[PDB]
Every structure is written in C-alpha cells, then in structure tokens.
C-alpha cells in the first residue's frame, strides 16, 4: 500500500491466513518452531507491552519538559530544572528568581512585558519547529486516526521522525500558554507507538489489518497515560476510534492503556502521588437528591457545544478560505500575541489551563483558603469575564497549525458551568439552610454536596456536547477518579448532555474536523434516509460515458485503484511489468470478486461496507455485469 | 416463525427499517406523533427497566423460598418462615426446633433418618414438578440461550408458565442439597423476563431481531443479580453470550445488569447486607510477590477441566444411550438417596455449597474461631475425603432431568484449591516466617497474605478451565467483589487457567453442553482449518440428485425452509394460500437474494454467514447459478 490510500480488509485476512497455515505447516519439522510460533503469539502483545512503555516515559518526558519550559515564563529554579516551580522551591526564595529579579532585581511594567515577550517568542519557537520539521502534528489528531482505523493509508504519518516532532511540538505549544491540550493526542502518539514498535516484528509490518488492530489497542493509552484512566481509554477504543473492533482485541486494548497507568504508577521517586495538575481523586458516596443539577447542568454542556461546534468550524472555514492562512505563522503570532496581552491582568485567566481543573476539581479543605474557598462577588465578576474570555479564544484556538487540544480547556468551561451550581447552591443554604433540599436529607456537621464533582461533571457534560462520546466518556470519568459507585451519575449527566447538543446536528468536533478536511470517513452513528433504488448508487453517471473495463491512459483519466477482467491492481500490474522487464498475468489476476444483485437496496450493501470494508464491488442482474461500485462512489451519493 | 427455527438477520432489519419509515412518515401530521415516537424510543430502556426489576425481585423471591425450604432439612422456625434460619434464630431456642425435638423431644439415628427422608421428598416432589410441567427448565440453560442469540427459534422457551416453572424447580432443587446452582440459570431467566416484560409493546413483539437484542442485554441481568455483580455481566453478555452484539448494546445492556444491581441494593428492610450467602467484599491492596501462586494454581484449574469436561459429558452420553434415561426420576431418588446418605457423616459436605464458599472466602476475624480459623491435620484430611466425594458427586450432577447449576459446584471445588495454597504458606510461615518469600516484603503485625482472596481466584480459574471465559470473568469477579485495583490477579489468573485447560481441547462445559444436545451452533471461538474449494460445501452431494429448484411433496423429500425461482418461504406459502382459499405469488415473490461467486473459499463465506447470519444464499459462476448454501449444509460440513 503506498501513501493516500485504502485497505482491502479482505486482502490483508487471507494474507494473515496463508501466514499462519505456512508457520502451522513448518511447525511439522522440529519442536523449534512451535516454540517460534509461541514466540510470535507472545510478541504481539509484547508489542502491546512496549507500547505502554512508551506511552508511560513519552508521558512522564512530555510532563516533565512542559513543566521546565512552561514555568520559564515566570521564572526559573537554578538548582533544578526538569521538575516543576513547587518541586525545587519546595523541597528545602534564593534558588528561585522570576525574571524581574533577573534583571532589576526589586516592577509590574517588568513582569508583564516579561511574561508577553517570551510567550511570543516560546509560540514562534514552536510554530516554526512544526511548519519546517512536521505539519501532520497540527491538531489534537484524534479524528485523522479515526480516518486512518477506517482503512487509510498514511506512510508518514506513524514515522518516528514525526512522533518526536509532535512530542516536542506538544510540550512546546503547551508551555507556550495558548488555550490547547494535550490530553487527547496520545492517541496519536499510542498509535504511532503501536506501529514503531510493531515495526520490530514483520507479523505487525509486513500485514497492514494487525497495524489496524494494534492502533485500536493502542488508541486507549494516549487517554490512559494522559489522565491515569486505563479502563476510560480502553472503551473510548472501543466505542469512538476503533471504526471495526472486535471483541478479542478489547481485552488486549486495555493491557495498552493500563501497561500506560503501570508505567505512571512506577513513575515515582520523588514522592508525588499526582498523575496530572487535576488529579483529584473522588471516594465520596453519593445519593438520591443529587440528580437534579447532574441534568440541568448539561443544558450548557450542549449549548456550549452549539456555540462551539458552529463558531470554531465557521471559523475554520473562514481559515481556509482567505488571505490569512497564507501567513498562519504570523496569525499564531498575532493569536499568541493577544493572548499574552489580554490573559495577564486578570490572574484567573493568566494562569494555566490542566491547573485551573486542578482548582476547580480540589474540594475545600479546612486549611485552604484559596479563591474558590475565599467565603467576593467582584471576583466571580472577573471569573465570568475569564470564562467569555476563554470561550472566544479556546473557539479561536482548536483549528490552528499547531499541535492543539481541546480536552483540557473543554473540561475547564464544564467546570467552571459545574462549580457556578455548587457556589449557587452553598451561598443559598448559608441563609437557608433549613430549605426543603437540605432538610430532608443533610446530616448537620458533615459535607453533603461537593461542588468539585460537579465541576468534573460538567467537564464531561461539555466534552460529550463538543465530542458526542457516550458509552465511553462514562468510562474516561471512571477512570480518572476512581469509581464503580458512581458509574450512575456519569450515565445520566452523559445522556443530558448530549441529548441538548442533539438538538442542533448530528456532527461533533471530532466528525466536524473529519468534514471540513472532508477525510474519506464513512460515518458509522448514521444511517441512510433516502429512499432510492440501487440504480443510482453505481457509476458511471448519466452525464459520464459507459465503465472503462493503455492501462495508463485509463489510470490518467480516471483515478480508481482498481479494473475488471477476474481483477488486478495498479500496483501488482506495476510490479509485474518491472519484474518482467527486469527478468525479459494470469497469476496475479485475482479470480474471486465479490458481487450483489443490482436490486440490492442501499441500506444492506452501504452496511456491507461498513463493517465488512471491502474496497469495491461489480453489480449485476441474472448473472450479468453490469458497473463497478467503491468507497469512493458510495461516499459523492452521501455528498 | 415457528418452533425450531432459524431466523432471517436482513428480513428482521429490513421490517425493523419499514417500522421506523412509516412511523417517521406518520410523524408529519402532529406533535402527538413524535411524542408517541420518542415514548417507542424510550420503550427499549423501559423494558430493561422492567427486566432488571423482575431480575432482583425474583432473585430475591428465590433466595426466600431456598432459605425457607432447604433449612427445612434440619427444622423450621415457627414465629417466620421467609427469613433464614440466623434470622428467625438471632433477632431476640424456643422458637426453633430441630425436629430431633419435634418427634421425640430430645438422638443422632433420628436425625440421620430424617434428613434422608425429607432429602428423597424434595428430590421427588422437584423432578415430578418439571416432569410434568416444563422439560426445558433442565441445565443451567447458558447454552440453550448461546444458541437463541445464535439464530435459533423456539417459540414457549420464553413463557410464562416455562419461566415460574423453573423458578420454582430451581429453588426445589437447591433446596434438595444436590451439587447444583442457580446464578447462571438467571441468565436463562433474565433472557425470558427480556422476552415477557417485552411482551406488552409491539416494536419488540413484533421484529425479532430487538428481542435478540434485549435477550443480549438482559443475559447480564441474571449474571448480576445472582452474585451482586453488574459489569461481569454486562461484559459476559458482550463476550460469552451475545453471538452478535453491536456495541450500542452494550451501554444499553450494563443498565438491566445494574437495574437487577440496584433492585438487589433497594431490597434490604431487616438490615441484612449481603447479596448472597458468600458475598465477601475486598479491599485489601496487593503487590508483586503474590503473583507466583496465581499462576501455579491455574493448573488444577485447568487439570479441573480435563476431569470435569470429560467426565460429565462422558457420562451425559451415557445417560442419554443407556436404560438408566428411561427412568430418570428414579435415578434422581438413587441420586438423591446417595446424596443424603454419604454427605451426613462429615460435616463439611452436609453443609451447602454456595456457604461452603462463604466459609472460605470469609478471612479469618479476631473473633472467629471456626475450622478454618482453628489452628488440625485430621480436619484437612476429611477436609480432602469431602472435596473427592464433591468432584465424584458433581461431575454426576450436571447432566440431570432438573434445573442444574455448575457456577457453585465449580466455584467451591477452586475455592478449596485455592485455599490450600492458603493454608499451606501461612502454616509453613508459622515456623518459617523469616523465609525469604516472607523476609523482603511482609511487615510486622499486619496481615500480608489473603486465603480467601486466592480461594476467589482459584474458583476463578476453575470456572475458566470449565467454561473458558477470559475478558468478562475478570469482570465477574471485579464486580462480585469490588476492584478495579484488583483486575491484574483476575487477568493473569484467567490465563493460566484457560492455558492448562486448553492442553486437551478447544470446547468448554456450555460449548460440550451445546455439542452433546448438538444445538445448530456455530463456534465463533474457532476458525476453519481444512483447505478445500467451495464444491465440497456445496449441495446436493454427489450421492444425491441434482437440486430442486408439487411444493407440498417437494418439502417433504427434504426440510428446506426456502426454496429458489425471486425466493419465497413455506410460512409465506401457507399463508398465502390460505388467504386466497378463504378469499375466493408476485407480490410475496423475494426478488433480491444474495449471491456469492462460486470460486469464494470457505473462509469468507463462512465468516459472511457467521455475524450476519443470512438463512440461505445461491451460488453463481460467471452468472449462471449452481445451488444454494445453507446454515444446515455448512454445518453438516462442520459436522
């Protein structure tokens, strides 16, 4: 398979059975070669295994470069540099120094034009790194590989040259300050993992359907190693990237993602229990009463999704199609710019983003006095200023030319939308604690309602609004604190959440970076309407001569993989005649193509690609041929 | 459909898709019209509302009528009878008599005669029960239900009065003392309950396919119910039960599980907590020293297997090709007789099974002070007489004319194995404990080493090398004791027990139970190895005449549902008919079947019709059609 291109999932099988009936057969001559198939068998999830390995050092090396390179915009610790601000000012301000005391020593003037210059110059740094190293690392890269698991072709895509540009292009953006995550790409990484070192052993290299397989598994340990939530990754494998997933790979898809949260339970000398700046794990039982806000919630979980989903895609749009994207540096620039000069005075907005989660998730404790338990108006006044703030600029931040994710900012609007209820609710009951809701049923003395899981909650609400996840966003919540007693409050706020951002479209963020790139995705969560006959699904068209059933020409003229006879291919023709001519087709020439009746209605032979996969297909009536129907027909009919 | 048969996937799809047409096209006249339709909607959820509902309630009704009944053995407490005997025994023995008191007021000769007769009066009044009102309530059903969601029809294995019959006969039995167990059989129920509270809606009355799918979904209602475990279920039915099961079921599927969770978390007045009489929670941390006996156990797991397998279905096949089938209930009374009379003398097998498990899984307590707890050789001695008698008793229990369970048997003899590992170290450390296994690690004064935990996972590994369950039975015993800290031992200890168990054979105790009855499955577990064209799986053979492409001798040369012209179906015949009879075949003439070109090999056609399941196809070769493939042909082939 060369560059752009799809996969005969049909092909791929048989090639692995003529494989696997070839090592059975020359199992026959010794004992050394069972044991090698042995060896196989246990090498492809040792491939599972190195995947996690990877994905726990690449995690724990992008944390720990973000943490070095981030803080630089206020300051830096002398005595240790790969930690972070509070690890070497902490551990005993003379080690420390902010850049004002670099450089007056004693100043507001100082510290703003500070934290602007070299935010620009960390957001010119990495634009530059990606525009003249790699531009496939642009975006979270979630939705490319959701294209990539439905049968295309990428040859770079999974190089290594690639991988370490995005990781270092990540950490870069990151640390840059910019409204952009990093939460997701793992999965990109995962998967590029999962192919670098699958490249190892030719079962994984030389049969392109196991690469689909050990990305399906691999796609868990981005979301695994990210957060800490292995089970929440391994069913977002199964239910939002994997487009074909069968069952036998769920349970190797988990080692992936948990192999991730092995490697960062290991990960740990120095005494830090945190997997990420928000990890707030939860053990508080919960109860009847609470259901209320865990619903009404997610009506701005789905309305922020309308806002989102139309104003960053329309904007995107509007990216595309004028002047500005012919200097997209400059833009970031100009983005990064604004951001540094309107992110400062306001210290809520100026601080980080995966922090702000941190806060907003850590529950009041009796020695904490910080904002959130400051018990004032002026400043929920600045944070409301804060949350429109983000909105315009996290919408004006996703589709930029640089690695860019949404999962973290996302979770801090659900977040701020989850902890609005809380504040509302503990200020209402500091008067009217004797209210019917907090009659009934709170206990006096103890906590009874805690505004931070409500916060991840609404984190979820947004990101289900933004994204549509369901079956596994439950799961992704349930790993990232602990659960297993509170599996039900994620279901509903899930189900509330997307059913308010139902009632706009049928696209989220993910199938909307799918649309406009416009990437060959046959989408699986629909179904076909139309009523119609099969006699327009095939091609030609009308307005088109009769099929073309020399070979060059034909190729140039129309740009189809493949021709009847049985069939061939571009590329075994292609081989076939340097072979001969190195050397100087009825061997090649494939005698098995599949067919349907060309009264077959749509809504069983679009599904038979759907699941099944297979590249194209002729048509006939009483045993006659009559066209040829592929992804590619099959998808201008949906356009 | 009518009984034994197999359905048709497309023709369920395609009146599924005809429903949602016309009501969306009946939408358009009032707002009435889409209520009604987002209430059809709702209607599936409902359903497993109910099922779950139902699930907890008569899981709770059975355990009542088996404490109610089973201690009847022994005496009954006067004041209350639908309690337990601790109940009626402890909430303050002149309200309890052991019927020692009752008949002379005072010894072990009539207490011995006693439990012997009324042992033979549950087995007679149990086996004269289900023979004279269901004959399916036999086994514990798993299997029958594996081959329903496999395409296969039976129209009363769903009633109502099938259902309270096995209810009923399955609380009989348990109560007879016999090895046999309920928690599978649930599953059974579950699926029928999926069926009756399906009853009253038309969409799952009415299109068969939605009750497969609500026959998936509620598989893990009984699985959750019976144990207290929710997702074990939830991912049985994904792995072990559902032969297709699209992922949207899943999500779908998890609530009727946690319905039966939550109606067993309600259900609780008299402040009694466990969910069943072994329901040991755990929350004991683990490390890396404890893996070596998870794996060495796994042998006896898998060796289990090797006898069990074997020995019952050996014996299955002589019951079923012998006189002793002739008079079944006489061989229960024999059963039953001997069941009574060599378990009496030793106290740990007159005791039951499911507390048997109770009792080692328990960890040993400051205040307790029982068997396992006192710290002898002569009690592990007996301890060993009572585990061969077990094995020799239960191999002998499964296959028998009354509602069977092996879940218990299994789960108590891998208890006991595991428990001797248990047993062993702690006795070995006693005198040793400076040994190096116990030197690096263990601290003083806090227990290091669980038995019962191992005993958990040693009826694990049994249940594994019996049934070969891998990816949900780590959910099984993740959620029957919570986990999710303790999902590495489960995953290691279900491998080691499916490897030793799979060094005899590729088929488990519900497979075997679907092999001996001979149910038209087809193992989706195992793939096609012979190389041949696809003129062998072809019909007519060359010892039969060319095919029949009138009708009423025509079906009875052969048992063809279908026959070739379009295509139509001996159901569409008779009714046809029959209308045109009381009234004084284009429009019933199916005019799109499916066609496979006849050089196909074995290896996609196979697959094609294993996850779609199509009852029928037509062969053609350049156009011009040869025969017709069938479920049945492809399964002689198997055969």
């Given at each position: 398979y060369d560059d752009f291109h799809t996969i005969d999932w049909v092909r791929e099988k048989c090639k692995d059975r003529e494989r696997h009936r070839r090592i059975n057969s020359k199992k026959?001559?010794?004992?050394w070669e069972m044991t090698k198939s042995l060896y196989d068998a246990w090498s492809g999830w040792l491939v599972v295994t190195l995947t996690g390995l990877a994905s726990g050092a690449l995690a724990g090396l992008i944390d720990i470069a973000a943490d070095w390179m981030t803080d630089l915009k206020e300051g830096i610790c002398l005595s240790a540099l790969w930690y972070n601000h509070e690890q070497c000012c902490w551990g005993s301000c003379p080690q420390w120094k902010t850049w004002a005391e670099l450089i007056i020593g004693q100043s507001y003037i100082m510290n703003y034009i500070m934290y602007i210059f070299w935010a620009l110059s960390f957001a010119f740094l990495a634009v530059s790194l990606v525009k003249v190293?790699?531009?496939?690392?642009?975006?979270?890269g979630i939705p490319e590989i959701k294209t990539i698991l439905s049968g295309f072709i990428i040859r770079g895509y999974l190089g290594k040259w690639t991988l370490m540009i995005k990781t270092i292009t990540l950490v870069l953006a990151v640390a840059s300050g910019?409204?952009?995550?990093?939460?997701?790409?793992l999965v990109h990484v995962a998967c590029c993992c999962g192919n670098i070192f699958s490249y190892l052993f030719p079962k994984y290299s030389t049969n392109e359907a196991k690469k689909r397989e050990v990305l399906s598994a691999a796609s868990a340990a981005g979301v695994s190693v990210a957060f800490g939530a292995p089970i929440g990754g391994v069913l977002f494998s199964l239910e939002e990237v994997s487009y074909y997933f069968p069952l036998k790979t769920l349970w190797r898809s988990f080692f992936a993602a948990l192999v991730a949260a092995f490697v960062l339970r290991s990960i740990n000398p120095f005494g830090n229990?945190?997997?990420?700046?928000?990890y707030v794990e939860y053990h508080t039982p919960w109860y009847l009463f609470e259901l209320f806000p865990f619903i009404l919630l997610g009506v701005f979980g789905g309305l922020w999704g309308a806002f989102f989903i139309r104003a960053n895609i329309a904007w995107c749009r509007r990216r595309k199609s004028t002047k500005f994207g012919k200097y997209p540096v400059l833009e970031v620039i100009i983005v990064a710019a604004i951001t540094a000069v309107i992110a400062f005075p306001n210290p809520y907005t100026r601080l980080n983003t995966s922090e702000l989660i941190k806060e907003l998730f850590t529950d009041c404790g009796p020695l904490e006095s910080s904002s959130l338990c400051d018990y004032v108006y002026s400043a929920i006044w600045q944070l409301c200023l804060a949350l429109i703030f983000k909105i315009i600029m996290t919408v004006f931040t996703?589709?930029?030319?640089?690695?860019?994710?949404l999962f973290i900012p996302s979770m801090a609007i659900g977040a701020i939308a989850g902890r609005i209820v809380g504040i509302a609710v503990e200020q209402l009951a500091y008067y009217h604690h004797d209210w019917f809701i907090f009659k009934e049923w709170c206990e006096v003395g103890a906590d009874c309602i805690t505004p931070g899981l409500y916060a991840m909650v609404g984190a979820a609400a947004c990101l289900g609004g933004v994204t549509r996840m369901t079956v596994s966003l439950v799961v992704i919540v349930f790993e990232l604190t602990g659960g297993l007693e509170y599996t039900v409050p994620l279901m509903a706020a899930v189900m509330t959440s997307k059913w308010v951002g139902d009632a706009f479209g049928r696209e989220g963020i993910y199938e909307a970076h799918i649309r406009l790139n416009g990437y060959p995705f046959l989408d699986a969560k629909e179904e076909f309407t139309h009523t119609t006959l099969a006699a327009d699904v095939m091609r030609p068209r009308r307005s088109d001569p009769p099929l073309a059933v020399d070979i060059e020409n034909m190729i140039n003229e129309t740009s189809y993989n493949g021709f009847p006879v049985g069939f061939a291919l571009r590329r075994d023709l292609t081989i076939a005649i340097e072979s001969a001519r190195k050397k100087q087709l009825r061997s090649i020439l494939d005698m098995s193509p599949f067919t349907v009746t060309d009264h077959t209605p749509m809504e069983i032979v679009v599904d038979i690609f759907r699941?099944?996969?297979?590249?194209q297909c002729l048509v006939t009536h009483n045993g006659r041929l009559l066209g040829i129907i592929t992804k590619k027909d099959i998808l201008r009919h949906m356009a």
């Open positions: 026959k001559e010794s004992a190293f790699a531009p496939y690392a642009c975006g979270s910019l409204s952009l995550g990093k939460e997701g790409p229990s945190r997997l990420v700046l928000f996703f589709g930029i030319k640089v690695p860019s994710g699941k099944l996969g297979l590249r």
